[PDB]
PDB file of C-alpha atoms and ligand atoms in Angstrom:
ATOM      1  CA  UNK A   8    -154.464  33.433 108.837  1.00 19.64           C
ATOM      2  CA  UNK A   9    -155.163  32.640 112.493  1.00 16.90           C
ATOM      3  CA  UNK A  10    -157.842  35.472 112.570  1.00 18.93           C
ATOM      4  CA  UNK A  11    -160.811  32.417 113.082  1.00 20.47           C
ATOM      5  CA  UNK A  12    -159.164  29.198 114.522  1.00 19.88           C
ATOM      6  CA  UNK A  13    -161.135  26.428 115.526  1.00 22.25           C
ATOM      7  CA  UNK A  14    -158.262  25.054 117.986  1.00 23.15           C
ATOM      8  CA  UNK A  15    -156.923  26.885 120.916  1.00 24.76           C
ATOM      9  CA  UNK A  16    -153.178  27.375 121.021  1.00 24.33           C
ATOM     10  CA  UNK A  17    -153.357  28.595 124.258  1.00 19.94           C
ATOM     11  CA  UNK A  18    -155.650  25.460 125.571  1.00 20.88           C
ATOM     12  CA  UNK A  19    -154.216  22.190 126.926  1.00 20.62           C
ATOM     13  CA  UNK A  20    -155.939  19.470 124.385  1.00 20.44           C
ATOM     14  CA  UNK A  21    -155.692  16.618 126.663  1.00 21.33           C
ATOM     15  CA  UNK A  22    -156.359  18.569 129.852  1.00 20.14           C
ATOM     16  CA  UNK A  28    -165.947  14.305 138.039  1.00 15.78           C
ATOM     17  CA  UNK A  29    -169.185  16.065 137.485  1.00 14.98           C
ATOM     18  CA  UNK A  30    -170.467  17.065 134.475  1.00 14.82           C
ATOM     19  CA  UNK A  31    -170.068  20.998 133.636  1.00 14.99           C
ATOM     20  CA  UNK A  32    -173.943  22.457 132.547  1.00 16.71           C
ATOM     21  CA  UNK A  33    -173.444  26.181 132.068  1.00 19.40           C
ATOM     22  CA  UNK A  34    -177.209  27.592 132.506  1.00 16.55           C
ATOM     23  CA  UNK A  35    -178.489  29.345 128.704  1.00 15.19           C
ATOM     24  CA  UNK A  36    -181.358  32.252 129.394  1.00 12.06           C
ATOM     25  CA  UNK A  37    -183.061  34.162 126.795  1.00  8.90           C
ATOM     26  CA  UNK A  38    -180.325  36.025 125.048  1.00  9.85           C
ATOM     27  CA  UNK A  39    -179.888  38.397 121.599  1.00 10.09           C
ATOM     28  CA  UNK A  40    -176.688  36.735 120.901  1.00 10.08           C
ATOM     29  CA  UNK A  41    -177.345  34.589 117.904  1.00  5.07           C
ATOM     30  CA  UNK A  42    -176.958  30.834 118.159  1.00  2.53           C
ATOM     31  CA  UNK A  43    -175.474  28.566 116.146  1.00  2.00           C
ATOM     32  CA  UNK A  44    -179.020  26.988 114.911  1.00  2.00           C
ATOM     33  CA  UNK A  45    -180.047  30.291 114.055  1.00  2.00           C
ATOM     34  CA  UNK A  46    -177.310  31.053 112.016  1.00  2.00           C
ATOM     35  CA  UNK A  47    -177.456  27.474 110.208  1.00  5.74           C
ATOM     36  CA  UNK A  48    -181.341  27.946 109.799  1.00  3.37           C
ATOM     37  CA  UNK A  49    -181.023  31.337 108.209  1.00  3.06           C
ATOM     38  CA  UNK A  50    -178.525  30.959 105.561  1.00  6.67           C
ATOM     39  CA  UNK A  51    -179.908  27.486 104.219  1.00  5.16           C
ATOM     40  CA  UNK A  52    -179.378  27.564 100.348  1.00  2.00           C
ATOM     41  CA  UNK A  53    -182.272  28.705  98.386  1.00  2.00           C
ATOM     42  CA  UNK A  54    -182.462  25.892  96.883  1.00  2.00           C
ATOM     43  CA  UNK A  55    -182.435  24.058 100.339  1.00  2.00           C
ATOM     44  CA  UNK A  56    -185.338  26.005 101.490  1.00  2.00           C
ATOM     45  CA  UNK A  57    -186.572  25.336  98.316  1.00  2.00           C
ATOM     46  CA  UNK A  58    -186.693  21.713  98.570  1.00  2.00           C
ATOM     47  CA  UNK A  59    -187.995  21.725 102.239  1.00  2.00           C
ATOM     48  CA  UNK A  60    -190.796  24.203 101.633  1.00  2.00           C
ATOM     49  CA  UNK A  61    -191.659  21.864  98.746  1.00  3.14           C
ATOM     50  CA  UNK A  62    -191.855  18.792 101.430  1.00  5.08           C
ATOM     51  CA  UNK A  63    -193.910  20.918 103.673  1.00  5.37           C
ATOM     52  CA  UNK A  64    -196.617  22.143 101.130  1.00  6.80           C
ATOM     53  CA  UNK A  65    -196.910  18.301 100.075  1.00  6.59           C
ATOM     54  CA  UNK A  66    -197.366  17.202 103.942  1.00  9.80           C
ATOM     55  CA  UNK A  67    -199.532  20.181 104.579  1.00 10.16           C
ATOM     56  CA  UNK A  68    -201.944  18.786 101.791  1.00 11.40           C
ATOM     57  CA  UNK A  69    -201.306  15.021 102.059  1.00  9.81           C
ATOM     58  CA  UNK A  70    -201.619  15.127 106.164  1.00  9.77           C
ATOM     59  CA  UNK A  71    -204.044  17.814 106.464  1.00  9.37           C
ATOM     60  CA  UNK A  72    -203.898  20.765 109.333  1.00  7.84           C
ATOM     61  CA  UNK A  73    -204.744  18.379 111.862  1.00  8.73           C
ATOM     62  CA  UNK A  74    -202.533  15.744 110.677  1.00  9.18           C
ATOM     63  CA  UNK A  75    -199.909  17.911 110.055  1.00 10.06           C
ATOM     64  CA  UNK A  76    -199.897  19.301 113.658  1.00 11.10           C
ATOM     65  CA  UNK A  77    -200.178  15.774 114.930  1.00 11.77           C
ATOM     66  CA  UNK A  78    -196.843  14.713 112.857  1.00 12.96           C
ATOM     67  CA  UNK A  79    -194.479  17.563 113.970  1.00 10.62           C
ATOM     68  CA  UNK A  80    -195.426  17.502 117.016  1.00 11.35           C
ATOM     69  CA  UNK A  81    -194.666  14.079 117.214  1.00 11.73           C
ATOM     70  CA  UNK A  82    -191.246  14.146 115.960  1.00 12.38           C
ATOM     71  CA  UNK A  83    -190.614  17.269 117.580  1.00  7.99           C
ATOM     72  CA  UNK A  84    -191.714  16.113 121.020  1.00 11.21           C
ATOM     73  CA  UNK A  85    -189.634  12.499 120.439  1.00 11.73           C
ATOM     74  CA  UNK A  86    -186.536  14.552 119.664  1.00 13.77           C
ATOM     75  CA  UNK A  87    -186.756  16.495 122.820  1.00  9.08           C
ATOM     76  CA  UNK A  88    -186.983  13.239 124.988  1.00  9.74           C
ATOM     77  CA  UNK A  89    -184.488  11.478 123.369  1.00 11.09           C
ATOM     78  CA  UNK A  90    -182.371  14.451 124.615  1.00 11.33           C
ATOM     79  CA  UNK A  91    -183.768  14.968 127.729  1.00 14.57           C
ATOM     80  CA  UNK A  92    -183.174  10.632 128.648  1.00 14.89           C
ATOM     81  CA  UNK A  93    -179.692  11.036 127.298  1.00 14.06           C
ATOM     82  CA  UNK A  94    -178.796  13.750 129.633  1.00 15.59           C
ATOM     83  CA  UNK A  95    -180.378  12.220 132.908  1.00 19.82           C
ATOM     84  CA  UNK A  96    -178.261   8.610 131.909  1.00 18.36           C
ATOM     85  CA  UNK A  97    -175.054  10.805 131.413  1.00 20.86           C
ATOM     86  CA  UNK A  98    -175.445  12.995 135.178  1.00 22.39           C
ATOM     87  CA  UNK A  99    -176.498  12.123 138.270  1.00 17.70           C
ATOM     88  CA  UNK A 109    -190.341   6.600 130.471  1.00 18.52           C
ATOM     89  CA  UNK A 110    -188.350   7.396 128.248  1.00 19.03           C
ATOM     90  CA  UNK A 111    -186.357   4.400 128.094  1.00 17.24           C
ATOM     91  CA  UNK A 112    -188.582   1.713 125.928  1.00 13.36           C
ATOM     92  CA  UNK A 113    -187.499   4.097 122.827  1.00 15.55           C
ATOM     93  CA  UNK A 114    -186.270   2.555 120.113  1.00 18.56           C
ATOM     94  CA  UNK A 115    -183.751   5.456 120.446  1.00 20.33           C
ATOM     95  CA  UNK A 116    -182.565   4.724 123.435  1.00 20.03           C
ATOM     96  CA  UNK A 117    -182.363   0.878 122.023  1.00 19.11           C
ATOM     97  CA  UNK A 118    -180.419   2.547 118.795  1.00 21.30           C
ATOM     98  CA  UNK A 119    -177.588   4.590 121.230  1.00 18.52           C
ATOM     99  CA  UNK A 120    -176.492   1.645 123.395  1.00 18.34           C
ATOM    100  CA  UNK A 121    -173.710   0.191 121.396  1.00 17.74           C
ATOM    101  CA  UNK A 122    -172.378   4.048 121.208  1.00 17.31           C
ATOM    102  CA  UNK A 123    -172.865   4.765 124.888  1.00 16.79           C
ATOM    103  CA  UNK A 124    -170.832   1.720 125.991  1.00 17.86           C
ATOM    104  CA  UNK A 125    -168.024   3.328 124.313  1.00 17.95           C
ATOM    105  CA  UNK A 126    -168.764   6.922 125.949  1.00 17.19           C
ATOM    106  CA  UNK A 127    -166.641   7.785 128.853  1.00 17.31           C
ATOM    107  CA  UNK A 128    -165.049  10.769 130.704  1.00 12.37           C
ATOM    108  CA  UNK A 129    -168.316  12.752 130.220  1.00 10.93           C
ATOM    109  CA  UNK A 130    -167.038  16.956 130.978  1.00  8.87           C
ATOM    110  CA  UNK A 131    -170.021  18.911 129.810  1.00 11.02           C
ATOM    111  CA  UNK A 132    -173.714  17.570 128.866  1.00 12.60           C
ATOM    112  CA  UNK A 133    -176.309  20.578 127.503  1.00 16.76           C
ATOM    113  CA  UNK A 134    -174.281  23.103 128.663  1.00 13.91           C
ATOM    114  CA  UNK A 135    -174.278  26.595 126.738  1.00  8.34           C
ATOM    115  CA  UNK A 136    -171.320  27.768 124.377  1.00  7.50           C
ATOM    116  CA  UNK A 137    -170.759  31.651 124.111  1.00 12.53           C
ATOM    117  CA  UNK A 138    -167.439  32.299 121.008  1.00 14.91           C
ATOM    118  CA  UNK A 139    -165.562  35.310 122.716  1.00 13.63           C
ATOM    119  CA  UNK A 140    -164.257  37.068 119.400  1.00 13.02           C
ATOM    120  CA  UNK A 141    -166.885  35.467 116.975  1.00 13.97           C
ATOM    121  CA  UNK A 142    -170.051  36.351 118.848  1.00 16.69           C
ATOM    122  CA  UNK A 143    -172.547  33.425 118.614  1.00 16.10           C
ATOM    123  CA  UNK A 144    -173.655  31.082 121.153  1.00 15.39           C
ATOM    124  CA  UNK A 145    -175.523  27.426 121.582  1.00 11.42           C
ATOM    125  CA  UNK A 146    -175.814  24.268 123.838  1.00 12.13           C
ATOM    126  CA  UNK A 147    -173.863  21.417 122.569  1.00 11.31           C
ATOM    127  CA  UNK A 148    -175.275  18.174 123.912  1.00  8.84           C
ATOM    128  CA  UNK A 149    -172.539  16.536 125.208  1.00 10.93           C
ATOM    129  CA  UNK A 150    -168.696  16.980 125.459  1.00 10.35           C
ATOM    130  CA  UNK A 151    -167.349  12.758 126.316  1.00  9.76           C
ATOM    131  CA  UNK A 152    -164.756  10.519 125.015  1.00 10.12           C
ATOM    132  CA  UNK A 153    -165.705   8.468 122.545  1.00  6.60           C
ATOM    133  CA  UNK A 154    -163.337   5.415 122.467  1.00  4.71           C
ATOM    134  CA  UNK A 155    -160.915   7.117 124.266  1.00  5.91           C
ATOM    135  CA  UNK A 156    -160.864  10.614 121.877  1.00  8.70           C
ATOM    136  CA  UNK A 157    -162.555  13.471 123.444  1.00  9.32           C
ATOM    137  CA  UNK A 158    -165.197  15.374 121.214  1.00 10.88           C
ATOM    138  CA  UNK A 159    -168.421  17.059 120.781  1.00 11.49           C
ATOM    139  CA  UNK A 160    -171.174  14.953 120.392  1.00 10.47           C
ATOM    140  CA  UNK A 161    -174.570  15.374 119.198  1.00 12.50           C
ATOM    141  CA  UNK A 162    -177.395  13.290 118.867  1.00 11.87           C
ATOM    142  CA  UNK A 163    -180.162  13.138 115.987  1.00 15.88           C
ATOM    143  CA  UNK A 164    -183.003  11.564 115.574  1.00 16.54           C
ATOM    144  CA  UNK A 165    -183.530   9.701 112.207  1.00 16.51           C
ATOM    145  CA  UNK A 166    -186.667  11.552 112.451  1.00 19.51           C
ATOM    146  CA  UNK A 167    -185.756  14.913 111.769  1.00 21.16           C
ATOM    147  CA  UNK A 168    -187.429  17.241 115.157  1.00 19.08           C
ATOM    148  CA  UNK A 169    -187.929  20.190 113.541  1.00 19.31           C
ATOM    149  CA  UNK A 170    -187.892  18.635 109.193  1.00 21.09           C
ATOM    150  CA  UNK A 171    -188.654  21.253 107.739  1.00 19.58           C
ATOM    151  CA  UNK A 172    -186.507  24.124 108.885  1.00 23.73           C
ATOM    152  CA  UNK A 173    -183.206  21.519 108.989  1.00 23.91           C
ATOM    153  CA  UNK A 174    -181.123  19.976 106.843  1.00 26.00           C
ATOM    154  CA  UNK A 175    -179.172  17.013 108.219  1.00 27.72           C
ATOM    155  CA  UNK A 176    -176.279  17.886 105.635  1.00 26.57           C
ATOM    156  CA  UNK A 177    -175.200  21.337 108.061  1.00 22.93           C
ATOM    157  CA  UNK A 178    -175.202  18.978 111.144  1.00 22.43           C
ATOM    158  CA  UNK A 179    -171.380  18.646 110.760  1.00 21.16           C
ATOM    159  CA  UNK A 180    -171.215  22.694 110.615  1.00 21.90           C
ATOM    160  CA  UNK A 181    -173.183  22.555 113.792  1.00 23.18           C
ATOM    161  CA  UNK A 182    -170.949  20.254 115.591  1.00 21.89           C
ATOM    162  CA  UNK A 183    -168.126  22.546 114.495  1.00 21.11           C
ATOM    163  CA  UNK A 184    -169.287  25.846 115.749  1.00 19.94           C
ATOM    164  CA  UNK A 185    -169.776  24.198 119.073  1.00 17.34           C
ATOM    165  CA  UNK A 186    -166.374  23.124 119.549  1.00 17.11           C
ATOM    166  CA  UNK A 187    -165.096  26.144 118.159  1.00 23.81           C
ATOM    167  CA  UNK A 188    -167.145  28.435 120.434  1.00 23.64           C
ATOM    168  CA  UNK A 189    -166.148  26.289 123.458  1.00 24.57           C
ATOM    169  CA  UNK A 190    -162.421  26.430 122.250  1.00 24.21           C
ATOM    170  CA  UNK A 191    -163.002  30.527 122.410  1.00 24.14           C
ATOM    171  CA  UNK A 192    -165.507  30.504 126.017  1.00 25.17           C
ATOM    172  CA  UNK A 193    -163.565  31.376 129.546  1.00 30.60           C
ATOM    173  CA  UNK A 194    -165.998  28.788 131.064  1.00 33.22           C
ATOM    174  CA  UNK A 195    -164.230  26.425 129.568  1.00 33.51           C
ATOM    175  CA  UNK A 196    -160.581  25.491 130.770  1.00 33.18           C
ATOM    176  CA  UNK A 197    -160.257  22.838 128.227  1.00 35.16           C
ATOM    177  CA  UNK A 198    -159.907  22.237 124.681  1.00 32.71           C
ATOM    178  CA  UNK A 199    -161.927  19.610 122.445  1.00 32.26           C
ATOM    179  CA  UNK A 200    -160.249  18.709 119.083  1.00 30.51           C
ATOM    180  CA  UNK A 201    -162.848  16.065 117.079  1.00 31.92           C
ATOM    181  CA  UNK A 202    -166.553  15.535 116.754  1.00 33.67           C
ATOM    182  CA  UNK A 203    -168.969  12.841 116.696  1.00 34.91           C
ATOM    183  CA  UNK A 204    -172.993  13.097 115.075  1.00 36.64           C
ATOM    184  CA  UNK A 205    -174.785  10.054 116.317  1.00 37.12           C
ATOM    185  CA  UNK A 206    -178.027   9.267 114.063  1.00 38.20           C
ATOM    186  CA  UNK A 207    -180.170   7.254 116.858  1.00 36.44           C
ATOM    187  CA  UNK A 208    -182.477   4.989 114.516  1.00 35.15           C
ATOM    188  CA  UNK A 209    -187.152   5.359 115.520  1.00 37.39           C
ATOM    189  CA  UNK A 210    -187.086   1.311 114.934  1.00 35.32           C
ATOM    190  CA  UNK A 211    -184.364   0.378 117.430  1.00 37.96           C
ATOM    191  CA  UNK A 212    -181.568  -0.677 114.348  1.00 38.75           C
ATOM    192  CA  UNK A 213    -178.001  -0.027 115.832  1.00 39.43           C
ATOM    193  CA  UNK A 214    -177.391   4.005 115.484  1.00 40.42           C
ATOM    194  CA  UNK A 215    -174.469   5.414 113.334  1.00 41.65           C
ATOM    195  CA  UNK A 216    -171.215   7.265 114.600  1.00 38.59           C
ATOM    196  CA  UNK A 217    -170.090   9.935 111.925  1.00 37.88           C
ATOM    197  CA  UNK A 218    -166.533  10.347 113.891  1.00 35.64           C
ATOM    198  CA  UNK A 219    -164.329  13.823 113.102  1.00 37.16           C
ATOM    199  CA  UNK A 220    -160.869  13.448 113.352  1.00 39.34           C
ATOM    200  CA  UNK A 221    -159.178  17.520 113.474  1.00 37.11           C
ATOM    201  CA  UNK A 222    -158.106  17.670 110.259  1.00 36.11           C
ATOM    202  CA  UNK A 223    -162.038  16.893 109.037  1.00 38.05           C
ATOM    203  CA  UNK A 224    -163.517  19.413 111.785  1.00 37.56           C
ATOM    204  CA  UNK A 225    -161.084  22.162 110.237  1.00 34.86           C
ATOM    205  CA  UNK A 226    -162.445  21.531 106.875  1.00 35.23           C
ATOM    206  CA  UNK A 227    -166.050  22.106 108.220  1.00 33.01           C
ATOM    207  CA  UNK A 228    -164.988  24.962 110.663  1.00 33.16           C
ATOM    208  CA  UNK A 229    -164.480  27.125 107.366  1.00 30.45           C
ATOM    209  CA  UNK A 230    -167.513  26.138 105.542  1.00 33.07           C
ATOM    210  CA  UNK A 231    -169.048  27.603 109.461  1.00 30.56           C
ATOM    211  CA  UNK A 232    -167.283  30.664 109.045  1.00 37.41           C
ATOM    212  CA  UNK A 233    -168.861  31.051 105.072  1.00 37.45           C
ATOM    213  CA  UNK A 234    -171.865  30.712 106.773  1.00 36.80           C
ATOM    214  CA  UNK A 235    -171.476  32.856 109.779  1.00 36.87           C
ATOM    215  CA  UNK A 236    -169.955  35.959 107.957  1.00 35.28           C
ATOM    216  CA  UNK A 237    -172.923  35.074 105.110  1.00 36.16           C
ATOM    217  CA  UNK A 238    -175.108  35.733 108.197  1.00 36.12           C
ATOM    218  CA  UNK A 239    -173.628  38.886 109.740  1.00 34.69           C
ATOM    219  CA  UNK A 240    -173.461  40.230 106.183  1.00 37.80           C
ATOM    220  CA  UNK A 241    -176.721  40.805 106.295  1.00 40.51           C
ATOM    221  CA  UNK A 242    -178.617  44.201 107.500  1.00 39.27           C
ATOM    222  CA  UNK A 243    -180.647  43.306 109.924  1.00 37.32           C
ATOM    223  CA  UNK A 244    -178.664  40.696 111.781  1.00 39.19           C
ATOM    224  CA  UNK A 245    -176.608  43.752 112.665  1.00 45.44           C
ATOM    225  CA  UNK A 246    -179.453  45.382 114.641  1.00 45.38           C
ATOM    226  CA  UNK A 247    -179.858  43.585 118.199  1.00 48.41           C
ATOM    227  CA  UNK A 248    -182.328  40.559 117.939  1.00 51.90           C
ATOM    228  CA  UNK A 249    -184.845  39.965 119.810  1.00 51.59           C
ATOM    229  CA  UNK A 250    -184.586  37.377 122.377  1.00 51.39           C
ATOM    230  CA  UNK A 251    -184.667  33.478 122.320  1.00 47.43           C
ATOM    231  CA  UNK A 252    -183.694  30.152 123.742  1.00 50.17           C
ATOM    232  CA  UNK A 253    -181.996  28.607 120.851  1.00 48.46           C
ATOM    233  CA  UNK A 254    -179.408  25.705 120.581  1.00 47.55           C
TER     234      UNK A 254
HETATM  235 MN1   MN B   1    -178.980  19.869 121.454  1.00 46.33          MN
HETATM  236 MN1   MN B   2    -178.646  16.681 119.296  1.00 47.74          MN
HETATM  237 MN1   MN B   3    -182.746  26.980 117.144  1.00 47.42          MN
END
């Protein structure tokens, strides 16, 4: 029953510098990794498809120029957001997209800071742990420009918010508990960005399509030998 819980009984829910617990190379596998690797066939499918087409519409060198690009934009849309949350960049139309959802971010506890699940054994960095209008959750931003398109789907980015808080729920370095989530789709041509709030009840739902995927994961052979190691959110 309670085996897997996404919520903390033992954890206050409600419960001023921002925490960032330092991530290192590690074998423990994160919670992109685990998303990445058990895509649907018919996922991978679709984005190999997309990549072949790219490949031969773009060309090697225009190929390497576009995910570069978008990879390089998705970093420093990161890397602004967590310099204006702690103590260049900024003519983004990202940045532009995010300001009607950052005027409603307060109370800002963690920002990149790694997650380690004590009983489940997977780790990450969630971007940011704030209150957004006035209920506390994991956030994480995305580029409407997918960083990394062909190895992601944007439909597991609700998973991914889910094995965050769920890790941090289960991680000693965290005294607190966080109950909803927020994705934030930050718009390339400066159009407002979108909030996709969680309420609990939705993160639960998710949390056990995680767990499908995690246990679909550590099902496997391979995964069971120690990996080798990587920085990996
Ligand atoms: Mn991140
Ligand atoms: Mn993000
Ligand atoms: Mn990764």
């Amino acid at each position: 029953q309670n085996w897997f819980p996404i919520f903390n009984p033992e954890r206050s829910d409600k419960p001023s510098v921002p925490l960032k617990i330092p991530l290192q190379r590690n074998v423990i596998p994160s919670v992109t990794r685990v998303l990445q690797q058990t895509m649907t066939k018919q996922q991978v499918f679709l984005l190999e498809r997309w990549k072949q087409r790219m490949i031969l519409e773009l060309g090697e060198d225009g190929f390497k120029e576009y995910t570069s690009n978008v990879f390089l934009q998705g970093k420093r849309f990161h890397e602004a957001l967590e310099s204006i949350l702690s103590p260049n960049l900024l003519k983004s139309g990202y940045i532009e997209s995010v300001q009607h959802i950052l005027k409603d971010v307060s109370g800002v506890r963690a920002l990149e800071s790694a997650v380690q699940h004590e009983t489940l054994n997977y780790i990450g960095l969630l971007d940011c742990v704030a209150e957004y209008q006035g209920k506390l959750c994991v956030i994480d931003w995305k580029t409407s420009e997918k960083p990394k398109p062909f190895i992601q789907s944007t439909f597991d980015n609700p998973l991914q918010v889910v094995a965050y808080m769920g890790a941090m729920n289960h991680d000693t370095n965290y005294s607190f508990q966080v109950q909803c989530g927020l994705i934030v789709v930050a718009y390339k041509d400066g159009s407002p960005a979108h909030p996709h709030f969680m309420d609990a009840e939705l993160c639960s739902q998710y949390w056990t399509k995680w767990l499908l995927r995690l246990e679909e994961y550590t099902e496997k052979k391979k995964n069971q030998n120690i990996q080798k190691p990587e920085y990996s959110e």
